[PDB]
Structures are given as structure tokens and as C-alpha cells.
Symmetry: C4
Subunit: 388 residues, 4 copies
């Protein structure tokens, strides 16, 4: 009935409590389930939904051959209630796209789907399913975005967009959106920096995003910005590197990418700042997308220690993980005076690791909680290969 | 909460932005999906839905043999949210029909299904699923209609209906409907003209429709009419012929059908007038239903040039297309002071082209947008033949 | 928002217009569809739904073996929007029952499911899914009911129930229900009469039902009653016999069963009185459940002519039909000052006629309409046998 | 619109009327249905839903191998309308859990899912899908709960939780929850007693629960408590033992477990107190989970007779039963001044009894009713083995 207002800080967090798990791939063994990627959650005052990307093909069907390009004309953004299998029967259509972001300003939904050829990609903005605006590739090199929820406060929604090489220097922009309309956008001058698939959240009148450096950083770059779009950037200080691949924990860097031969590629991830502290979610393996854990490093944000203060296990290393992202449940939902931070974890199955003709994901999600919790292993559970 | 009012012009349009794609046929490879035809969109103040026709048979099932007549007692009009597969699980029933039209007057839905034997076809009118009226064949020769959404303004909804030979002179009627009730109807005297499957839209107190000539016109006939039903007809002036089949672009004709050996048959299509200008959506091939593009011809409506001013690619020629139609998103939806023009494209797969025992469609849709866009190819994506 | 009020007569009717067809069996060839029987429609001010009975088994599955008794502990009453396949995905649960009836008093739903052993059957009454009352077998011989919608006026809902031999004299009761509560019930003294599966409707302060005589009547028995339950009975005068089996049209009887060697068994059916006139829906065949037609006999109700005044074809004789019933759309729905009469037709496929291990139904429905219509053939369309 | 208030007694009950049956396993033979356990019902003022536990695997699919632990990271709590098959298409996600409870305080839903490793299990509390609180294992030995609905009155919801050996003495706690928040909790000192899977209900300002003793009681232990959490415990006096396994009916014990060599293990069950009387629902067999019946023992609660006063058959002994539980429909729903007691019955199929690689359940439910009823047999109906 009202919009998400700003000026709120994240809630106190001791440990993470399980919110949802869908077993999408296990169910897909026989049921009708879309081949997914990017199962990211986003909530409005009344609902939480999982958004994802599909090639428009179902599990255990030839059309899941995955010979196809990640960026194809068939890829669309869809959504469904959290916890349920992303089947064609309980999934809503969002937009044609091979890269996107979505979020609620409170009473409605903002979706941004980027589709088209690589040289001239276009983002189609929509407020409640209605095209409200569009942004075209300003650099001509695979324009892309969050693949995680954008953030809204005081009727305004913000996001980050990248265009350029995943090889080196790329170009970035922050957007300010009102009911699907683009009200100003800022160019981000971050020489040396590489921003991709940002996991954002709100923190008192500002918007903080912890992203992915695919150029040469094993540590993650972050950016915080104004409703005017005044910004600040840097990498997460902490030696508890949070990307993948990554070297062993060494002395970190708060303003530059730490390569160490493993800083090259990466994976979408998130982190939650808490003053000088930081919560780092990351894989267990240093080179593969397996296992996942949440690390609380009291200095994370200000220091460069490789020393933390607690680790909660989410998925053990004998199991597969994948994309990770942040989303928040607001005070307008929970009668609270703070924002509840949560995160979803993609659990990739199939190619290139396992021997299948396909590649899909399943998910689990967790939320803040300033009470007791437990670590454990909540893997995908599918038994591959399938009837391949 | 209120009805769609008149006196509004189409919004400014630079290029077309993707709105939805369903991948219905790709999903049908394993999922439960109806064999479709005519996937046309129609919106109410709060929702957009895709209406389509089914023989009541699912893809990859013997009942899809398609040996059956297009006009069978099994054919029904159904609808579903846009973007989702037209499965029996997410499709609503509209009416028994082998030819139809539907549209919203704002707060409700008007559906018209034509069923029965060829000699005595009957249109059953319904407002919100309740039979409100009926019209019977007045010529006794396959009475039929739009196969695209009708148009409503100031509580009144209008449509066009044809009865007679697809071979030559046919007979036409314009209807005026109020809450499913027929308030007057007009006979259209168009000697030399052949109107079929009209793609209509509203334009300030009037209703413009660009239809299909199956007799001998490679160019398309149009008609514009009053709320009193005073009308005007003619063909689209432009040399950029918009039907299929069609000869190469030559000098057009604003008041008569241009045959050139290819003016015979045809395909459902649409066009959007803009003063002396016109937006022409058409196939790429001159003789097959493949490829699709949107052409902006500044004189389209007044001149006969074969010269246009821009072409946006939708589906390339190596891929299949099919029926095309118009639908509009009103100001009561978008806070705008104009109407947003949009269009859907049917992508036929199977017979007679491909080697299958069936024939179905998939869809993609686009909307106006006075911002940046991109052309590309958004084909059906299904890999035929199926388990045939 | 308000209840269905009484004091309304049926609307004028020239012919019958198609309302819905589901193709349930054709879709069941591959999709998930319950094996049905009794697909009867019932509407509330805002919605029309099809109620049916299932053994809890799907088409093309071993559990559809139909070796099972019609009256089994697995049989339940369910419902779904009209026109859609009675799949487990779009069907709502109503009640455990092997015989039932349902109807809306306007704002809510009344369902009556009869289940249990033959000697001690019990009807469980529910208003909006909540058990409101119960009635037990008062004769101890397969207590049963309408298998068609009951009728409600001024908050009160009425139905008919039978207990006793289908072989000869049976015992009957009329009920008066208020919000699921039984407010009085009357015993019907009809010696010589045999009432089963009544197809009722409202007609100005009264409730008229045309039922089925399984004892020895080829013509149909009827009953009309007060809100006090004062009643009158008799058979439909007309020589245009409306049951199945039945002899050729001869001179009818207004107060007794006409046997003629074919008056034995029967099939559920309906008729609509209109003064001295009557609309008779019946099969085409005199001995099998095939073909269906609507006959208008101006004297039907008062005379015994075998002469009618018009016949509209619904399903031709080369095709299968089955149960038939009545339902009405009220003035509170249609802005009309009269009741719109409608009827649904069950189209049985499989055993005992066709060679399958199962037996199911599909449906089509029609409504009043005082405008133009057309007869035709709208059969089930399934191609048996199935993967049997 | 309002909350469930206290101070109400159970309604008068003569016999039990069938409310719902789902045939989930029969439908699962071909349709998409989750492998279930604990299909317990819980209602809010406007709706009744069946909650259940799934391993996230469908019937007739390899992932149903059931080689997996009951407590796995894949197990989740889900819900759906009563009577419908627990398919992925009509089931809502509730929470990640291998043990849970749920209930409505009137306008909303409270769900409690317990997940994680055995040594450190955690209950995640949620009000309307939003994590509101958490409780961790205080004894470190498989913390678990009701597996039946909790009870709410005057905005407060109560439940029982166990932690410790199923072998002997265990430790118990009663909780008081307000909108998902834990407002105080009490330790239950019950030396000699063993409480597990309690079937609770409200009875005038108090909450009565009849549970399961897995240590050495063939009779069932009960507990009643205050909104302050002042409590009283004991076993059900009656000689009509209500657990399984159990010895033949002997003289019972109101304050201690009656072993008799069969008091060891057990099964979830319920009972309804009525003054000195009690309604006992139990299996027919004394050692297997087969058959089910409801027994009315006028002294049940106060005496130790093996003499009852009436028995209603639900499922005969030639058929399988399983978990049993209680749920109530409040006065805020039924215009009544009392609470309507109801109960659901799980009907386990497969392992370890039958020869399949899986184990699932189906359900039937009944409600109070102070009118006529009938006993009978309403088994699961599935024909095993499946395509195994
Ligand atoms: C199960 C199947 O069809 N696998 C095929 C494979 O045989 C072929 O080499 C490849 C490339 O087109 O596409 C799929 O992976
Ligand atoms: C896969 C299949 O059954 N194809 C049949 C074909 O063999 C037969 O000639 C034809 C005409 O009845 O109907 C289908 O096309
Ligand atoms: C396809 C199939 O299983 N048919 C069987 C049949 O073989 C058996 O004689 C009968 C009686 O139990 O049950 C079904 O009709
Ligand atoms: C149908 C099937 O696959 N059954 C297998 C069985 O062969 C194997 O021994 C067991 C243990 O892993 O798992 C299932 O029960
Ligand atoms: Ca990196
Ligand atoms: Ca032509
Ligand atoms: Ca008879
Ligand atoms: Ca025991």
C-alpha cells in the first residue's frame, strides 16, 4: 500500500537461517521444469519471488542440449513463488532477456531485461509488466547487468550496468529509475576496476553493491552510491578472498584487485557490510564452484587480515554450488526498524563439470536472523546423469 | 475501474522493443502444450493476455495429426498470460470457435467466437464469459473475423466480419458492441475490395484496421470508421507491399489491389498509420511465411514510393514466421496521453513446410517505444521433427 | 454480493448457442486428465464451474482399469472452470462422493456428496467447503441424488434425493437448505412414479425438475415444488419421448410411465417447460447413448402429440453422447429480468461400447439465447483406443 | 479479519463425516505427485490446507529411491488445498524441514520447520512465509515436533517440542508464539513420560494434546496447558489402547505407560477428550499400521475400562493406514459457538511393508458432526508395485 522508504540499516545478524530450497533439478527428473540459471530472489511488501533465466527448454528434453549460446533469442526472464520448482505451470513471464535484474519499490515490480545482438544490446525496462523505458549498448560489447535484484528506496530504484570486455577494462553506469522511468544515469569512472553482476542492497540512504571482477581480482570490488548518484568504489579490504577462482587467503587490498594467478575469471557473489565488519559468502573450493560458506570477519571492510571470526557452512565441498546473490526483506514487511539481509545460492549441475548434455541450477536461500542457527549441507540432490 | 476512452492518438515510435516470447513449441517437446494458431494479444487496464485457437490437442500426441479441418467442432478460443506456454494448466477457456476476436473495453473482456457448419456459421458474443449476443452467417459462406483483437472506446467495441468467397468478392460488416450487446451494425460496400483478418487499433475517435486481401492484392486494404459506423476504405498507398505472397516492391496503389501474379492468397498482417507515414510489418521472403521486419515509410500512407526510411529486423529469413497482428496498450494503463502500439508475430512450425504430422505456432511481441531499440532474430527455436 | 432471488421466469429462447467444450478426453491422450463422469455445470453470480466425479485415476494410466465399482471409496466430487480439461492441476476438491449435486445461492457454493456403503449411504452437506449438515439413507438402498446442479432462491436451496430399487418403486425426498443447513425436508408420495437424477431449475417462486425413470418409463417424470415443499408430479405429456432407451415417438402420457418394452432403464436428461410448450433434449438413437438434439414442442407440456415445432442438432448419431443436465444463469449475473436456461452434455467414450479398459466423458454446453443459432455436431473427438 | 479467540469447547459429536480424500498415490501413477509423509490439515478462518513433507522427489521417478534418510537436506514443508494431489503444480512452499508444525491464529499462518544436522537441529519460525524467530536444539539429539497442526487462541499459538532419545527419557518444551515471535517457553518435567508428535487442539482457554510414547507406552500420554504455560500431564486412562504396536485391550493406566512387550515403538495418533469421555482413533491391527477406527469410550478419560460405547470404521484391516492427527475448524469459520474437531489419516504405501523402492502416503479426513454418519473403508487405492 506504500513504498519502501530509505534511512534503514541492515538488521543485527548472528547466523543464517534457511528460508527456502526448491529441489528443482530433482523434481525435473520426471516433472516439467525449466532449465534454469540465476535463480535470484526479490521481494515486495507482500511477496517474495524467485526470478530466473530460461532458454525455454525443459529438463530431460532434447531442447536442453545446451549447445546453444548463453545469449540466445530464446532466453527469457521469468519468476515464481520461492521454494517451488521453476515449472512452466507455476512460472510467470517477465521479459525476453539473456541478462537481467528485478526488484520491488514496495507496491510494484521493476524488471529489466537485456536482449539482442552483442554489438547492440538493449535493456527493456518495465514496471508491472509494462515497458516503461529502454537503454541501448553505449559501448557495443555485450551490455549486461546484476543477475541479482536491484534496490529501491523512496520510490527510486537503482542498478548497475556494464558494457565492454570481460577481458580487461570495462565501462559502467548506475541508473536511477522511478516507476520504470529512467530519471538520470551516471557514468562510473573506475580505472583498474572491473564490475560485473553486482549483488546490491540498501543501507541508510545509500545503496551498497559487492560485485564480480572478471579481469584480475580474486577479491571483490564494491561500490556505494547516492540517490544523486555520487559514488565511492574499492575492493573488499579483507584477506578472506570471496571470489572463485582465488588464491589461498593472503593479505587483501581495499582499493585494487588481487590477482595471484587466480584473479582472472570469477563467479557472481555477494557480501554484507556491517561497519568495519563484513559477512562473506563464498565457495569452499578455491578453483571450482563447489561448497559454500558464510564468513563473519569483524574487520573485513577496514582491515586486510586473513583472520575472520566465525564460519557457517551452507554446502560442503563434496557438492556443487554456483551463482550467489543478495536480496533484502524490508521493514515495511517485517515490523522491524531495520532491513533483513538474505542471500540465495545457485547450485549448478551438469556441464562442464558433470557428464550431461545440459547445465541447470537449483536453489536455497537464507536470511539474517539475530538468534540461533546451524551450519550444514543443503546441496542440489539431483542424481546425474539423467535420461540424458 | 473505468473504461478505455477515445480521442487518443498512437504514441511516438522510433523503434520496437521486445515485450514477450513464449517458446511454446520448444517447451511442447516434453511439456503439456496445446497445438496453437493465432496467438494474438489483447489487454485490459490491468492485464495483457494471449488469445489463441486450439483443436484441443497437445504437441507430440497423436491427436495433433492435423488431418482435421481448420474449422472443426473441437476448435476453441482460449487465453493465457503473455509469455507463458499455452498449456492446459495455464490457459483459460474463452469459447467454442474456429475463428474469433477479443478485446477489453477497459474493465472487462469481450470475446466473439464463430463456430458451426460453413453454410450457417454463428458468432457467439460474450462479455466476461457470459453469452450476451449472437450473429449468424448472412451470406452462407464461411463467416469469419479478425483473428486479432477488436477495438473499444467509450464503452463501445468494434470489429469487422466477412462472409463469402476467399476466391473473389466477399461481403463485409462492421459491428458496434456495448457490454457484449450488439448496438447497430453496418454493411460495408467495397466492390473490388477484399477484407479478411483485420488488424485494428484506435486513433482519436476513430478505429483504423489494416487487413488482408486474399483475392488479388499484394498490398493491404484498410478501413477506418466512426462510432456511428461512417467509414472510408482503400489500400495502403506504399510500394513497400506488406502481404505474402507479393511481388518485388513496385509502385503501389492507394485505392485498388496490386496483383502482379502474386496478389492471390495472403497472410494476416498489420500496419500502423502515422499521418502521411506508416509502419509496415511483413515477412522477409516474398513467397513464404519466413522472416519478419518492421518498415518505417514516411509517405507510406499518402505516397506510392517503394522507398522507406528505416527497417528493423525481427526474424531473419532462415527462420519461419506466420500470422501477424496489432494490439494496443492504453493510456488508462500507461500514465501516457497517447496509445502505445504493439504487435504479435506467429511463428508457424510443421506443415506444410517442415516434415511433421502437425502444424503449430509460437510467439513474440513488441511495443512502440520512442527510445532506443535493436533489430535481431527471435525465431521459434523448436528442433523438428518431434517424436512425431 | 447478494443472493439469487426468486420470482423470475426462464428467458425467451429461439435456439441454443454453444457456451463451452473441453475436449478433456482428446487432451487426456497425453496430458494429465482425470477419468470423469457427470461433468455438470453450476454458476454463482461471478463464476460458472463444471463439477464432476472421479475415481481418482488419470486417463492412459492403469488405475483407469475401471474394473472398480461406480460406487467406490475413491470417488470424489471435484470442480473446475468450464471449458478446461478436468486435470489435477486445475481442479478443486469438493467432497468424497459417488453421487452428488452442487449449486450457488448467489454468493456461495452448496455441495452435497453421498458416500459410504450401499445399505447406509450418507449425504454430507457443505457450504463453501465446510461440512454444514448430513442426511443418512432412510431406506437402506443406494441413496443417491441429482448428478446435476440443485436450485437456490431467496437464500434457500432445494434438491431431490432417492433411496430404494432402480428396479421398481423407489422412495423420494425434497430438501430445503439454508447455508448448508437442512431446514425441513419433505417425503414425496409418488406411487407408480420413479425419480432419479433430476435436472432442476427455477421458475418464478417454484422449482421445476425433469428427471429419469429407470423402472418402466420411456417418457420423463417431473416434479415442481414450493419453498414450503408443496409439490406436484407427473410425466412430460409429449409423445416426443426424451429418455434412452425409448420406443419410436407415439402418443405420450402426462401422468404415467410409457414403457413399450423400452421403458426399462434410462439415462440422465433434462427438459425446459415454457407454458404449454417444452424444450426436449435427447439422444438421436432410440437405444444407445449417441447423438443429441434439442426439440421445441409447443404443446410438449400439455398435449400428447408426437409432433414438435423445430429440432436443433447438437451431436449427430455417428457420435457418442451420454448424461445430460440443466443449469441456469441468473439475472443477478446477466442484467436480465429473466433466467437464462442452459444445458451440458456428457459424451461418454470407452466401455461398454468402445474397446478400452476405461470409460470417461467429455463435455459441451449451451445456453438459451433469443437470437440466431445453428445446429451441428460437436462430438468428443477422441481417437480410441488409447495406449490402453 | 479477526483472530481465533479462546474459551470455546469442542462441538457435540455423534459420528465422523468424510471431509476429504486425495487419492494422491493413485494419481501419482502417471501424474506429477510429490512423495509425501505427514499430510496434516490446518485451517484459517477462510481456508483449510494440507501440509506435508517431501524429499523433493516425485512418484515413479528414480529420485524416489528412498535410500535417503528421513532427515535429509532436501526435505521441505509444503502445503496445498485439501483433497488435491500434492503435485508440484498445486503445492506452495512452506519451509526447509524434516519435522514441522503449522497452524493459523485466524488471519495468518504460522509455520515451524526444523532442519539441520541431528546434533544441532534448528526450528525456523515464520509468520506468513517470513522468518520471525528460531529455536536451536537444547539437548543435541534430533530436535523434533508435532508433525500435526499447532494451536492458536487470542493471537497466541502454542506447540510442543522434543529433544533427546526415542529410546528412553526425552526432554520437552511448550512454546508460546505471537505472530511468529516466541514469547516465553516452558520446560516440561515429565519423568517416566515420553512425548513425541503431539496431536493438539483447543478446549476453553486451554490446549490439550494427545501424543506418542515411543519408549514403553502402548497407551498415549497427554498434556494440557495454560496461556501462562502451567501444565498437567498423564496418559489416557482407557484400556482401549490407542497406539501401535499395542497389546490387546487390558486395564489401562491414567498416569504411566503400559508396555506389555508392545509398548516400545509407536505411531503418531490423536484423541479427543469430552469430559470423562474420549474419542479414540486407532489402527485395527495391534502390530501393523493397517485399518483405522474411531472409538467412543464414555469413561476413556477417567476410567480404565477396556469397554467402549461405539466404534466407527474408517479403513478396514485389509488396507494400510499410517500417521493420524487432529485439527479443528473454529467458530470464527462455522457460525457455531463451539469448535468442530476433525482428524486426518495418513495411508502409507510402499516400504517397508509392500515391495517398492519408495514409501509415500495418501489421505482422508473427517470432522465432528452431531448428525448421522456411517463407517466404511476409504483406503489409499493405489495398485503397487508401480513402474518401480
Ligand atoms: C543426447 C544427445 O543428443 N547428445 C548430443 C550429442 O550426441 C551431439 O554430439 C551434440 C552436439 O550437437 O549435441 C548433444 O550433446
Ligand atoms: C505419425 C502418424 O501417425 N502419421 C500419420 C500417417 O501415417 C497417416 O498416413 C496420416 C493420414 O491419416 O495420418 C498421420 O499423419
Ligand atoms: C490393459 C490391461 O491391463 N487390461 C486389463 C485386463 O488384461 C484384465 O483382464 C482386466 C481384469 O482385471 O483388467 C484390465 O482390463
Ligand atoms: C529400481 C531401482 O533402481 N532400485 C534400486 C536397487 O536396485 C538398489 O539395490 C538400491 C540401493 O541403492 O536402490 C534402489 O532401490
Ligand atoms: Ca576474479
Ligand atoms: Ca494477397
Ligand atoms: Ca426409462
Ligand atoms: Ca508405544
Amino acid at each position: 500500500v506504500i513504498h519502501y522508504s530509505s534511512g534503514k540499516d541492515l538488521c543485527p545478524v548472528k547466523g543464517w537461517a534457511p528460508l527456502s530450497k526448491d529441489n528443482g533439478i530433482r523434481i525435473g527428473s520426471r516433472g516439467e521444469v525449466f532449465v534454469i540459471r540465476e535463480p535470484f530472489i526479490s521481494c515486495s511488501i507482500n511477496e517474495c519471488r524467485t526470478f530466473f533465466l530460461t532458454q525455454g527448454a525443459l529438463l530431460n528434453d532434447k531442447h536442453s542440449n545446451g549447445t546453444v549460446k548463453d545469449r540466445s533469442p530464446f532466453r527469457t526472464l521469468m519468476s515464481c513463488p520461492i521454494g517451488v520448482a521453476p515449472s512452466p505451470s507455476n512460472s510467470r513471464f517477465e521479459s525476453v532477456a539473456w541478462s537481467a535484474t528485478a526488484c520491488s519499490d514496495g507496491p510494484g515490480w521493476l524488471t529489466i531485461g537485456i536482449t539482442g545482438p552483442d554489438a547492440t544490446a538493449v535493456a527493456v525496462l518495465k514496471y508491472n509488466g509494462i515497458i516503461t523505458d529502454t537503454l541501448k549498448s553505449w559501448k557495443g560489447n555485450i551490455m549486461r547487468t546484476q543477475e541479482s535484484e536491484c534496490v529501491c528506496q523512496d520510490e527510486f530504484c537503482y542498478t548497475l550496468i556494464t558494457d565492454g570486455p570481460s577481458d580487461a577494462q570495462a565501462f559502467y553506469k548506475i541508473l536511477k529509475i522511478k516507476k520504470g522511468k529512467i530519471v538520470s544515469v551516471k557514468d562510473v569512472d573506475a580505472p583498474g576496476f572491473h564490475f560485473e553482476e553486482c549483488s546490491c542492497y540498501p543501507s541508510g540512504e545509500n545503496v551498497e553493491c559487492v560485485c564480480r571482477d572478471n579481469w584480475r581480482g580474486s577479491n571483490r570490488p564494491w561500490i556505494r552510491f547516492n540517490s544523486d548518484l555520487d559514488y565511492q568504489i574499492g575492493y573488499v579490504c579483507s584477506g578472506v578472498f570471496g571470489d572463485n577462482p582465488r588464491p589461498m587467503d593472503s593479505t587483501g587490498s581495499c582499493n585494487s584487485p588481487i590477482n595471484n594467478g587466480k584473479g582472472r575469471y570469477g563467479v557472481k557473489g555477494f557480501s554484507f557490510r556491517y561497519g568495519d565488519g563484513v559477512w562473506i559468502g563464498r565457495t569452499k573450493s578455491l578453483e571450482s564452484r563447489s561448497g559454500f560458506e558464510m564468513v563473519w570477519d569483524a574487520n573485513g571492510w577496514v582491515s586486510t587480515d586473513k583472520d575472520s571470526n566465525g564460519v557457517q557452512d551452507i554446502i560442503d565441498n563434496d557438492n556443487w554450488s554456483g551463482y550467489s546473490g543478495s536480496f533484502s526483506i524490508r521493514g515495511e514487511t517485517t515490523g522491524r526498524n531495520c532491513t533483513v539481509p538474505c542471500f540465495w545460492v545457485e547450485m549448478i549441475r551438469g556441464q562442464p563439470k558433470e557428464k550431461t548434455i545440459w547445465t541447470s541450477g537449483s536453489s536455497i536461500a537464507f536470511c539474517g536472523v539475530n538468534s540461533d542457527t546451524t551450519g550444514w549441507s543443503w546441496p542440489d540432490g539431483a542424481l546425474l546423469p539423467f535420461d540424458i
